[PDB]
Paper text:
The primary function of HLA-E has been ascribed to presenting self-peptides to NK cells. Complexes of HLA-E and self-peptide serve as ligands for the inhibitory receptor NKG2A, ensuring that healthy cells presenting appropriate peptide ligands are protected from NK cell attack. We have previously demonstrated that the non-structural protein 13 (Nsp13) of SARS-CoV-2 contains the HLA-E-restricted Nsp13232-240 epitope VMPLSAPTL, which hinders binding of HLA-E/peptide complexes to the inhibitory NK cell receptor NKG2A. The Nsp13232-240 epitope is presented by HLA-E and position 2 serves as a main anchor for HLA-E-restricted peptides.
Residue numbers in the entry:
A (entry chain B): 1 to 100
B (entry chain A): 1 to 274
C (entry chain P): 1 to 9
The structure:
Amino acid sequence: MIQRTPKIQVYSRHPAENGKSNFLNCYVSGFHPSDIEVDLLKNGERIEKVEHSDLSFSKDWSFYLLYYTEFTPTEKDEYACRVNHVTLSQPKIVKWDRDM
Amino acid sequence: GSHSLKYFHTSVSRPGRGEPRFISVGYVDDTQFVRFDNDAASPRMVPRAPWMEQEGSEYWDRETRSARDTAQIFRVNLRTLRGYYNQSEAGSHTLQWMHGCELGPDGRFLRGYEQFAYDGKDYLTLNEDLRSWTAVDTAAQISEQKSNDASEAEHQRAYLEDTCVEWLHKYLEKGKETLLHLEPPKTHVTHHPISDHEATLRCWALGFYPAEITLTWQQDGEGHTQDTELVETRPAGDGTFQKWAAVVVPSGEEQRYTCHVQHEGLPEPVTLRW
Amino acid sequence: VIPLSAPTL
């Protein structure tokens, strides 16, 4: 009956330089149970080829996963992460902000 | 310094939708090096670090046998636990198992541990003597008794004090070029006005390994913990980590705030300012 | 490597 809501961070592997290839990361942590869906979005549309780390957990038993995909940031394109979990009222969208 | 060999195992029932999902992952320190996932394209133990790709088929066979056996016992354990708690065959439940051995800086065994959780809380824990167990409730008391009957702590103690230590040494050799490399943070400050009289200072640490780090802001050389926003240390995706810390300060006063970075990879603690 | 014995609960 213990459920824990995911913490979500959306960020780049390296400081974003427009026009230069990079990796877009969505790190989800602190959640229970383990069943979760994480999608990366470009201009509101789900990116088809996304990879993720193997499910692991912390000393407090909460799960963590990294989802990531290659991307080339630009001034005009918007990126986001969409998380689907039982603790959420509806899928939560977290926008990428290159300063966070 | 100190090193550790640790694994995390998760089994999750999915009634009507197959055998429980079973995932095992192994780490040395902060580096993942193996996994077993019964839903993967190859549902066997497989390398997840470059330095393991050379290991040879006997290693993968023994680890696959062990992992498969663990998945089978966990499947049964999930059924048993349903019976202890009088739960329906219809819900999904989680069994988690974590274990590890830790060497101190002097190269010698410091500690071993092993714990089980059911549905996200402590269930059965191996005591520090590695000879006995603590049960959380009357169900886990039955598990404790069965473990006592089967001398399970003896098997676990031999693993933690011997096998785990032996293989930790082997893995540290196989992966030394990266496992023993300290990668210091690349640090910088960003500055963004937030009102007519205030700005955000954000202190970044990027590209570091291992994950342990301290990032703090000081004001006039004194503690400023209460007014600092800190994010959780997060993976870069290439085996290094990132973190940042931010403070909101009066415009014109930025120079009185200093960011302090401690990491094993730094010759000396670093300080940065705007 | 992982333990050769997985506990039965």
